[PDB]
RNA sequence: UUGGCGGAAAGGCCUUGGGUGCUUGCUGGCGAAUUGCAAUGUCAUUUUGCGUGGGGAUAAAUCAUUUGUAUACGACUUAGA
RNA sequence: GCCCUGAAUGGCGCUCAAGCGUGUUACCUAUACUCUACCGUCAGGGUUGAUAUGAUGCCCUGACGAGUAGGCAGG
RNA sequence: AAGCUCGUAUCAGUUUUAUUAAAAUGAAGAGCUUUUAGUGGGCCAUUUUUGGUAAGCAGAACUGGCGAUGCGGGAUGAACCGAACGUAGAGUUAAGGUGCCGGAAUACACGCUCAUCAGACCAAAAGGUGUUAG
RNA sequence: GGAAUACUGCCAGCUGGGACUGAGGACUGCGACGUAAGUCAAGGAUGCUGGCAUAAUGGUUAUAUGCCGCCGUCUUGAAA
């Protein structure tokens, strides 16, 4: 329905978000993920942090370079989870992965475009109340990520100047509502209500 | 030597037209030269095709034969009782530049049909607008 | 959805002993066929008469008289497990006996891993008077003007995407 | 609306009618939205076309009012 | 009008298949707006056309079309089985397809 | 054409001014055809060449000589009209 | 009933589970099964005051069809 | 493989009295010679079961799967689950599954667990101010 | 005190939509409708049409896409 879907990873589960996005990728739908650094994983910090180290151990017994290497960026962590859910090493899998983009925060021009969320992957709607959860930001920093401060610092600048845009939009909508409200009850407006509009 | 065919047991019984297809019903063409154009149903022909008119003066659709399966029948019915359509038949469309007789019949049928259309407001405008789907539309939900 | 059946067997009669005791019991089952099998199984555990010499005199469904009144049900259950069968008593608040007994099987399977074949329902009786209920979790619902919310409600989304960032409020 | 615990069908109907919940229910946005969605489904193609004409006419007046 | 589309657009998911073996003779088509098999019942029997562009002009046109029909519903998520005169090349998984409204019965 | 904002991948986003088309906001005058009962019935996207017409700038590296802060052999670092 | 010590899931992955125990509905499939098209084997039956295809021929009906050593028949 | 006799009171890897009649089901595939290629490995599981000391299990025999064997599932896998195969079109299923790879419901209902490699894969009798129902 | 409604089972009840098959090749027969003449959905598809007269669908092959997947003999319980 949307040529390019932008998904906000904040408050989502990596496994649920990755699985949902993975199927869409195989279906030809292009998807972009933003604010990956704010993505969350179930369980308290120790379990998530401990499991990441265990995976790092089995990289390669003899030579890490002649094998896999560990990406510290939160986006790569999500990409690794999504990569395992796609038939990599194949033309269909490789082509599907090319339709996916992941960035920390909301780099432009996506900042000026609407972003959606997946209702069936939100932590609020999936995790039991009162249970502990882990955030990729702390996990990524604990494993050597050196850009958490930069992302947080410039993300506030993203948060700023957006409320101003909404503030102008909110005032503009107020004028539209007043213009629409006064125009209501007219002959055309009254007839429209009959047809449900 | 040649062998004759066995005596087949089949009857070409008249087509059982669907209930939604009634004369004077506003049709929508799904394919062909006038695909998407809104049309008025006039008469059922002998060859199972439907005799239809735009009318021609309104949207330029002339008297044509159209298949019932390539048409969506709406619930908007315009009076067609006053229009005589007995002249048109299968032989009328036997082709092989516009024939003079075709133009004369088109205007005669249009004259009676135009007056009926003029009754309901916006009906003339409605028939002059080609139907097309829009984002979020769902034919199975859209009532017709 | 089980059904309540009444099954009577009378150890098919022999000369000089007409009309035997006609043992009577009530069995809950999904269908008549299942009810008949359970009746034979229970007999062999209590009455040494076997299915070969037994007979089913009649079987009729017992529908709840008033499937609108909310009734507190006291149930005594005997169930088998890794250890010998243990006597058990539970209280269930439900509209009808058939509905109440159904929840017991789910609870037994969850909290005791017991199943239908290993559970023997001894008796189901209504708690006709209040303050006779012993379990705390049943007295919980008897308080006057009992009002409680349903916090953190979740709406099952139909589409795969949502632009509203839905709230769980109720 | 007020109702005694365990009220029978007759009692519920009596209290239901007295409270006029149906009248109050309809006079709300939540109930109105349900009717609006149902109304939009029954709109015939001819009726749908009329909405476009009416909507455009309203747009002209609404936009004409603005910018002044 | 800006829009002239008279067909319902959909995406070809994949062929009917088991875990290992696949059946190219049957294709699975996803129709936009369909959520349950009951809604998909309307689309049964509708003509399915796949449109792709070829550099070499054939018969005066560079556009080539493959025709098919909607056969039966598939799964519980509105998926519908599809068949064509010639099966799809298997390179169009996720590609858009055109589902026409004819033959109509409304 | 005035002015402003956007450096995260800004490569875009907004406003003063007048110019020129449409305006289905409303009412009118003509053409649609023979694509013959449908054939996606051809209406976009990235790249390139040959052509004109109007603009702009109009150089370097290697080999060679030579050299050692280098050099197993390659390779690499110096200097020149 | 479930959890840690009581010694050292296929992957992606998951926690009101996408784990555990039970029940209630929808669906994917095997060369399996139900209907139909074709090749051959068997079995049954028609066949002449014979039809040019010639009775080793022209037909109608039902079932069957895996396979090593080995045997038979047709090419 | 031929012949003979006989289409069937000819029997059956089938169900019950009796001290082998007969009653049900299935079938024309029943009987006598005459002669004639290949065949002597067995493995796994079940059962009667004797023997025994750290152990395991060994061993006598019986009944099934393989041994000559494709197909779907078991992520791959002797001997596991269903299913005994001419070439094709249509539909329903066996076992397995329905978050992606992977075709199918991020279905419903009731409970259950925070595990610092949980859970989905016998040394455990007991310990734990862990949890839940008796 | 009387009505339904739910569940089960029946209809040699009605009514649509979708998917594959069109096998046989002059009548012989079993049936239905009609007073009859005759007709029929009754021992297997018939009735019209639109483009191909630029004559192609299609046949062989290079590549690509979705899935599947070293030989001849001989051991043992298969693999070895």
Query: Residue C37's domain is classified under what CATH number?
Result: 3.10.20.10
Shared domain for C38 and C76, answered yes or no, is no
Does one domain contain both C121 and C63? no
Name which of B70, B132, B140 is nearest E1 (Cβ-Cβ): B132
Range list of H helices, chain E: 37-40
HSE at residue A26, side-chain half, CA atoms within 13 A, is 16
Q: What residue numbers bound the domain in which C26 lies?
A: 1-67
In 3D, which of C49, C63, C60, C45 has the Cα closest to residue C9? C49
Which of A36, A72, A34, A33 is CA-nearest to residue A52? A72
Is strand F less than 7 A from the beta carbon of B98? yes
Dist CA B20 CA B41 (whole Å): 11
Both tokens of E76, joined, read 């519980």
The whole-angstrom separation of Cα A3 and Cα E11 is 13
Strand F footprint nucleotides (protein C-beta < 7 Å): 5-13, 24-26, 31-44
Q: What are phi and psi of E72, to 5 degrees?
A: -160, 160
Q: Which residue has the tokens 């608040």?
A: C93
**Which structural domain, as residue segments, surrounds residue B72?**
1-144
> Domain for residue C151, yes or no?
no
**Cβ within 8 Å, pair E1-B31:** no
Please state how this structure was obtained: cryo-EM
User: Can you tell me whether residue A49 is helix, strand or coil?
Assistant: helix
Interface test with B, best of D45, D48, D55 (most B CBs within 10 A): D45
Q: How far is the CA of A16 from the C1' of I38 (A)?
A: 75
Residues from chain A that touch C151, judged by Cβ atoms under 8 A, are 129
Indicate whether C60 belongs to any domain.
yes
Considering the domain boundaries, does residue C86 fall inside one?
yes
Q: Which of residues 10-39 of B touch D (CB under 8 A)?
A: 26, 28
Pick from E8, B140, B143: nearest CA to A196: B143
- C52 exposed, middle or buried (CB, 10 Å; 0-12, 13-18, 19+)? exposed
Resolution in A: 3.7
Q: Which nucleotides of G are covered by protein (CB under 7 A)?
A: 1-2, 11-16, 18, 20-24, 26-30, 52
Region of B58 please: left (phi>0), alpha (psi -120 to 50) or beta.
Answer: alpha
Distance, CA of B40 to CA of B58 (rounded, Å): 11
d(CA D55, CA A122): 38
Judge if C53 and C72 occupy the same domain. Answer: no
* CB-CB under 8 Å, D61 with A183: yes
Strand I and B141 CB separated by under 7 Å: no
Q: Which domains does chain A have, with CATH numbers?
A: 1-147 (3.90.1180.10), 148-197 (1.20.5.4280)
Domains and CATH numbers, chain E: 1-106 (2.40.10.190)
Q: Is the peptide bond before C13 cis (omega within 30 degrees of 0)?
A: no
Question: Do residues A17 and A40 touch, judged by C-beta distance below 8 A?
Answer: no
* Domain identity same for C2 and C59: yes
Total structural domains within chain C: 2
| Residue ranges with strand state E in chain C | 3-9, 23-29, 56-61, 71-79, 86-94, 119-126
Domain membership flag for residue C13? yes
Q: Is residue B80 a contact partner of residue B53, using CB atoms and an 8 Å limit?
A: no
Q: Which residues of A touch D (CB under 8 A)?
A: 175-176, 179-180, 182-183, 186, 188-189, 191-192, 195-197
Q: Apex CA E22: angle with CA E21 and CA E23, to 5°?
A: 135
Q: Which helix (H) or strand (E) holds A45?
A: helix A45-57
CA A5 to chain centre: 10
Residues from chain B contacting residue D41 (CB–CB below 8 Å): 141, 143
DSSP string for residues in A116-171: BB-GGGBHHHHSPTT--EEEHHHHHHHTT---HHHHHHHHHHHHTTHHHHHHHHHH
Q: Residue B139: which H helix or E strand, with range?
A: none
Structural domains of chain B, count: 1
Beta strand spans in E20-60 (E): 22-31, 47-58
**3-state SS of chain D?**
CCCCCCCCHHHHHHHHHHHCHHHHHHCCHHHHHHHHHHHHHCCCHHHHHHHHHHHHHHHHHHHHHCCC
Which residues of chain B between 18 and 37 are close to nucleic strand F, CB under 7 A?
Answer: 29, 31-33, 35
Q: CA E95, E100, E105, E106: dihedral to nearest 10 degrees? A: 100
Is residue A3 a contact partner of residue A27, using CB atoms and an 8 Å limit?
A: no
Strand order across the A30-34 sheet: A4-8, A30-34, A100-102
Q: B15: which DSSP letter?
A: P
Give CA–CA dist A158/D13, Å, rounded.
Answer: 57
| Residue in the block written with tokens 């006064």 | A182
Contacts of B104 (CB under 8 A, 6+ apart): none
Quick one: DSSP state of residue E42?
G
Q: Which nucleotide is nearest to A118 (CA to C1')?
A: H106
DSSP state of C31: S
How far is Cα E14 from Cα E92, in angstroms, rounded to an integer?
Answer: 9
Residue C36 sits in the same domain as residue C99: no
Encode burial over B118-134: b for 16+ CB neighbours within 10 A, e otherwise.
eeeeebeebbeebbebe
Residues of D in contact with B143 (CB under 8 A): 41-45
Write the DSSP symbol of residue C67. T
Asked if residue C156 belongs to a domain, the reply is no
The shortest CB-CB distance from A188 to any of D39, D43, D54 is to D54
């Amino acid at each position: 329905v949307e040529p390019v879907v932008v998904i906000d990873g904040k408050g989502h589960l990596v496994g649920r978000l990755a699985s949902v996005v993975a199927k869409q990728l195989l279906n030809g739908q292009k998807i972009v993920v933003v604010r990956a650094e704010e993505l969350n994983i179930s369980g308290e910090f120790f379990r998530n942090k401990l499991k990441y180290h265990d995976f790092l151990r089995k990289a390669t017994a003899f030579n890490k370079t002649r094998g896999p290497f560990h990406f510290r960026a939160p986006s790569r962590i999500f990409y690794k989870a999504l990569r395992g859910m796609v038939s990599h090493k194949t033309a269909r899998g490789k082509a599907a992965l090319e339709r996916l983009k992941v960035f920390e925060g909301i780099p432009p021009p996506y900042d000026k475009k609407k972003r959606v969320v997946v209702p069936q992957a939100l932590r609020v709607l999936r995790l039991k109340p009162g249970r502990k959860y882990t955030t990729l930001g702390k996990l990524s920093t604990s494993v050597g990520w050196k850009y958490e401060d930069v992302v947080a610092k410039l993300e506030a600048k993203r948060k700023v100047s957006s409320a101003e845009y909404y503030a102008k939009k909110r005032a503009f909508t107020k004028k539209v509502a007043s213009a629409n409200a006064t125009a209501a009850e007219s002959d055309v407006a009254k007839q429209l209500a009959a047809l449900g509009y | 030597d040649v062998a004759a065919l066995k005596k087949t047991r089949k009857a070409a019984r008249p087509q059982k037209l669907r209930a939604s297809l009634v004369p004077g019903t506003v049709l929508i063409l799904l394919a062909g030269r006038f695909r998407g154009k809104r049309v008025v149903y006039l008469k059922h022909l002998e060859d199972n095709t439907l005799l239809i008119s735009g009318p021609f003066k309104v949207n330029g659709v002339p008297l044509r034969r159209v298949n019932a399966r390539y048409v969506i029948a709406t619930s908007t019915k315009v009076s067609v009782e006053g229009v005589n359509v007995e002249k048109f038949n299968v032989e009328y469309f036997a082709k092989e530049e516009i024939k003079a007789e075709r133009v004369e019949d088109q205007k005669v049928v249009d004259k009676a049909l135009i007056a009926e259309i003029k009754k309901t407001p916006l009906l003339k405008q409605y028939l002059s607008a080609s139907f097309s789907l829009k984002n979020g539309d769902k034919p199975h939900m859209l009532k017709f | 959805h089980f059904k309540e059946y009444q099954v009577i067997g009378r150890r098919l009669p022999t000369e000089s002993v007409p009309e035997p005791k006609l043992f009577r019991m009530r069995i809950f089952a999904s269908n008549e066929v299942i009810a008949k099998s359970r009746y034979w199984y229970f007999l062999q555990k209590l009455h040494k008469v076997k299915k070969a010499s037994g007979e089913i005199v009649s079987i009729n469904q017992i529908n709840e008289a008033h499937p609108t009144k909310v009734k507190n049900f006291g149930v005594w259950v005997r169930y088998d497990s890794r250890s010998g069968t243990h006597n058990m008593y539970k209280e269930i608040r439900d509209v009808s006996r058939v509905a109440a007994v159904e929840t017991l099987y789910q609870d037994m399977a969850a909290r005791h891993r017991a199943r239908f074949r290993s559970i023997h329902i001894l008796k189901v009786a209504e708690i006709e008077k209040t303050a006779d209920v012993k379990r705390q979790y049943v007295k919980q619902f008897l308080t006057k003007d009992l009002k409680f919310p349903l916090p953190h409600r979740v709406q099952k989304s139909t589409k795969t995407f949502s632009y509203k960032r839905p709230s769980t409020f109720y | 609306f007020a109702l005694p615990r365990g009220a029978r069908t007759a009692t519920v109907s009596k209290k239901w009618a007295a409270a006029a919940v149906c009248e109050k229910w309809a006079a709300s946005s939540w109930a109105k939205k349900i009717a609006q969605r149902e109304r939009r489904a029954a709109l015939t193609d001819f009726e749908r076309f009329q909405v476009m004409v009416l909507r455009k006419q309203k747009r002209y007046t609404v936009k004409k009012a603005l910018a002044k | 009008a800006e829009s002239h589309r008279l067909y319902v657009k959909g995406k070809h998911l994949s062929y009917q298949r088991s875990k290992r073996v696949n059946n190219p003779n049957v294709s699975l088509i996803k129709i936009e707006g369909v959520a349950t098999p009951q809604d998909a019942q309307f689309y049964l029997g509708k003509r399915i056309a796949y449109v792709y562009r070829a550099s070499k002009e054939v018969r005066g046109s560079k556009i080539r079309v493959m025709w098919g029909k909607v056969t039966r519903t598939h799964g519980n998520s509105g998926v519908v089985r599809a068949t064509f005169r010639n099966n799809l090349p298997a390179k169009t998984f996720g590609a858009s397809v055109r589902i026409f409204l004819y033959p109509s019965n409304i």
